[PDB]
Design a protein around this nucleic acid. Structure first.
Ligand SMILES: OC[C@H]1O[C@@](CO)(O[C@H]2O[C@H](CO)[C@@H](O)[C@H](O)[C@H]2O)[C@@H](O)[C@@H]1O
Ligand SMILES: [Mg+2]
Length: 580
DNA sequence: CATGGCATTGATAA
DNA sequence: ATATCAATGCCATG
C-alpha cells in the first residue's frame, strides 16, 4: 500500500516544526557540487515532499535548515551538509544520523542506505536506493511520483527508527560515542571536504613528463632484456617471460599462476638483470597511473583543488577511509614518490601546510590496555621502541643492537599490533615458521602483560561475542568460534588488533573535535584539511605557525589520558612535502 | 563490442 | 601477522 504524503508546491509553517526526519537527496555518489534532486520532511504534522528549486529558494525553509534549535534526524547528514555548502546553504541542528548509528551498532552490516539500516529492526516499508535509482551506467533519477514516494518512505523510516536505534546504542553504552564523537566529527569532516586541498597541477604535470620519459627508457630495456615485447603490467604474461622464457626460479606460486609481486622479484633480482628493471618499472608505473594521472583526473579545473570524501561509516575498526581521491595513501616512504606531496600546497598566499602526527600511538595504546610494565616503562622513558624490543628479545645492551636486529624487532612489533602469527611474521621477515615462533616467544617473555592481553582479549571476544575500544566502539566476531582453523585464527587476530587500531581511531577523532573547538576559541584562521589515521594535516597563515606548534600537539596529546604519555611530532612548510 | 566483476598489484598507517 | 582504495589486465556475461 502506498504511503500518504503532501507533494507541496510551496513551503508551509507546519513543514518547519522543531523536530523532523529530513531527507535532502543527492543521488550522485560524489556529492561535491552535486544536484539535490528532492526534499522530504516527516514530522508531527505529517509527511511532505518538496522540489529543491522551491524549498532551497524559500527564505523560511533555508532559515529552518540553519536553525540549530530545529532538530533534524537524517541518514548521512554529511552528504546533505556538503551538497548544501556548495549551494551556500548551512545545515544545522542534526541531532540524529541513522547511518552513523547503524555503523556504530554493527559496522559489519555494511549499511549504506536507509533500507539496510531499517532491515536491522525488521522495518521494510522502504526500498533500497539501488532498487530505485538502479546502479552503474543504468543509474538515474526516476520520475517525480516514484522519486517523491521513495524520499518520503526513507524520511518516514528515519522518523520511526530513531528511538529504537538510540535505545540500543544506550544499552551498548554507545550513546555518547554517537552524540559526542561521530556526529560532531561528521560536521568537521564536511568542512574539511568542502574546503578541499589546493594542488599545483603544473608541478604535477611536469612530474608526469619526467615519469613518462623514465617509463619509456625502462620499458625498452625490459623488452631488450626479455628478447621481445610484452605487457609488463600483465602478471600472467610477465610470469611467462620470467618463469618460462628466462627460466627464473619459481619461489611463489599464486592461486591463478606465478607470483610476480615485489617480495618475489626482490628474491629473483640476483638471477637476471630484467628483474630490477621490472621493479623500477612497477614503481614508476604506480606513481604515474595512480598518483599523477589519478589526481589530475579529479582536480577541479576552476579552483585546482581536490575534494576527497571521508567515508565515516565503512571500516570495521572505526578508522575513516578516503576516496576520489584517496588522500590517505599519498607516497612518502620512497623519495621518488614522496615528491608527489610537493604538489599539495596551501590554498592561499602566504599560508603554510602544518602536519602533526602521533608517535607510535598503537603501541602506546597497547601498553595502556595490556598494562604491560616493561612496555609502559619504555614509553615513560620515551625510548626508541624498536631498539628497546630488540634489546629484550635478543638479550643485548643498546650498544649491541645492530641495524639488522632493530629491523627484525620492528617487524615483530607490527606483528604484535596486527595480531601475531608465526607464518605471518616468517613471511614478512623471510625466515622459517619456527624461527618466527622463537622471536614471538622471546617477545612474550619480555612483555608478559602483552601476552596476557592477547590471551584475555580472545577469550573475552569468545564470551561476549565482540570486542570494544576505549570509547566503546565494537566489532562482532562470530568467526572466533569457527571450527575452521584459518577462519578462527583470522578472527582471533581481529580480536587482538581491533581494540588497538580502534582505540587509536577514537583518540584522533576526539582530538579533531577538541582541536576545532580550540581553533575557534583562539579565532585562528588555521583549519583541518586531512586526517591520515595517526596524523592531522592543516593549513594556515604563516603568522599562525608559532601558536600552532604549541596548540596542536597539546590538544592531540591531551585528547585522552592513558597510563602512558601520548607524543605528537609536528612539522610545517611551503608544501605537504616540506612539512617534514 | 558493453559494462562489470575478479585477480593481482601496490600505496598509506610507518 | 591489521585496516583501507584504486589502477591495469582479463575473462565473465550477453
Ligand atoms: O556519502 C558517503 C556515505 O555514502 C555511502 C552510502 O550511504 O557511500 C557512497 O558514497 C561514497 C563516496 O562517494 C562511495 O565511495 C560509495 O561507493 C557510495 O556507495 C556510505 O558508505 C558513506 O558513509
Ligand atoms: Mg607517526
Amino acid at each position: 500500500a502506498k504511503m500518504a504524503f503532501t507533494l507541496a508546491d510551496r513551503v508551509t509553517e507546519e513543514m518547519l516544526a522543531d523536530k523532523a526526519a529530513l531527507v535532502v537527496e543527492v543521488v550522485e555518489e560524489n556529492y561535491h557540487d552535486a544536484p539535490i534532486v528532492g526534499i522530504a520532511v516527516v514530522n508531527e504534522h505529517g509527511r511532505f515532499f518538496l522540489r529543491p528549486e522551491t524549498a532551497l529558494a524559500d527564505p523560511q525553509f533555508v532559515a529552518w535548515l540553519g536553525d540549530e534549535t530545529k532538530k533534524k534526524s537524517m541518514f548521512d547528514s554529511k552528504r546533505a551538509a556538503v551538497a548544501l555548502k556548495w549551494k551556500g546553504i548551512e545545515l544545522c541542528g542534526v541531532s540524529f544520523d541513522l547511518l552513523l548509528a547503524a555503523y556504530l551498532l554493527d559496522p559489519a552490516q555494511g549499511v549504506d542506505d536507509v533500507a539496510a539500516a531499517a532491515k536491522m529492526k525488521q522495518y521494510e516499508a522502504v526500498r533500497p536506493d539501488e532498487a530505485v535509482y538502479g546502479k552503474g551506467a543504468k543509474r538515474a533519477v526516476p520520475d517525480e511520483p516514484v522519486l517523491a514516494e521513495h524520499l518520503v518512505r526513507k524520511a518516514a523510516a528515519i522518523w520511526e527508527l530513531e528511538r529504537p536505534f538510540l535505545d540500543e546504542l544506550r544499552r551498548n553504552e554507545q550513546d555518547r560515542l554517537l552524540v559526542e564523537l561521530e556526529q560532531p566529527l561528521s560536521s568537521i569532516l564536511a568542512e574539511m571536504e568542502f574546503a578541499g586541498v589546493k594542488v599545483d597541477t603544473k608541478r604535477l604535470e611536469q612530474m608526469g613528463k619526467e615519469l613518462a620519459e623514465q617509463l619509456g627508457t625502462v620499458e625498452q630495456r625490459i623488452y631488450e632484456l626479455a628478447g621481445q615485447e610484452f605487457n609488463i603490467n600483465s602478471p600472467k604474461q610477465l610470469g611467462v617471460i620470467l618463469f618460462e622464457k628466462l627460466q627464473l626460479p619459481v619461489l611463489k606460486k599464486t592461486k591463478t599462476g606465478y607470483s610476480t609481486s615485489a617480495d618475489v622479484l626482490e628474491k629473483l633480482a640476483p638471477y637476471h638483470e630484467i628483474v630490477e628493471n621490472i621493479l623500477h618499472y612497477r614503481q614508476l608505473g604506480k606513481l604515474q597511473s595512480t598518483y599523477i594521472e589519478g589526481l589530475l583526473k579529479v582536480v577541479r579545473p576552476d579552483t585546482k583543488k581536490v575534494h576527497t570524501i571521508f567515508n565515516q561509516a565503512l571500516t570495521q575498526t572505526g578508522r575513516l577511509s578516503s576516496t576520489e581521491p584517496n588522500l590517505q595513501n599519498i607516497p612518502i616512504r620512497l623519495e621518488e614518490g614522496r615528491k608527489i606531496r610537493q604538489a599539495f600546497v596551501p590554498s592561499e598566499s602566504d599560508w603554510l601546510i602544518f602536519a602533526a602526527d602521533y608517535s607510535q600511538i598503537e603501541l602506546r595504546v597497547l601498553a595502556h590496555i595490556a598494562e604491560d610494565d616493561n612496555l609502559m616503562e619504555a614509553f615513560r622513558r620515551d625510548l626508541d621502541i624498536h631498539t628497546k624490543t630488540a634489546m629484550d628479545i635478543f638479550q643485548v645492551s643498546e650498544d649491541e643492537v645492530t641495524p639488522n636486529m632493530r629491523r627484525q624487532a620492528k617487524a615483530v612489533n607490527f606483528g604484535i599490533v596486527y595480531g601475531i602469527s608465526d607464518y605471518g611474521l616468517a613471511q614478512n621477515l623471510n625466515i622459517s615458521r619456527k624461527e618466527a615462533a622463537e622471536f614471538i616467544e622471546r617477545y612474550f617473555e619480555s612483555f608478559p602483560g602483552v601476552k596476557r592481553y592477547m590471551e584475555n582479549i580472545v577469550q573475552e571476544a569468545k564470551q561476549k561475542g565482540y570486542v570494544t575500544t576505549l570509547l566503546h566502539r565494537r566489532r562482532y566476531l562470530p568467526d572466533i568460534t569457527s571450527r575452521n582453523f584459518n577462519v578462527r585464527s583470522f578472527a582471533e587476530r581481529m580480536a587482538m588488533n581491533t581494540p588497538i587500531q580502534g582505540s587509536a581511531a577514537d583518540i584522533i577523532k576526539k582530538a579533531m573535535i577538541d582541536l576545532n573547538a580550540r581553533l575557534k576559541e583562539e579565532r585562528l584562521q588555521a583549519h583541518l584539511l586531512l586526517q591520515v589515521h595517526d596524523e592531522l594535516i592543516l593549513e594556515a597563515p604563516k603568522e599562525e605557525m608559532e601558536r600552532l606548534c604549541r596548540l596542536v600537539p597539546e590538544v592531540m596529546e591531551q585528547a585522552v589520558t592513558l597510563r602512558v604519555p601520548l607524543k605528537v611530532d609536528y612539522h610545517y612548510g611551503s608544501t605537504w612535502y616540506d612539512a617534514k
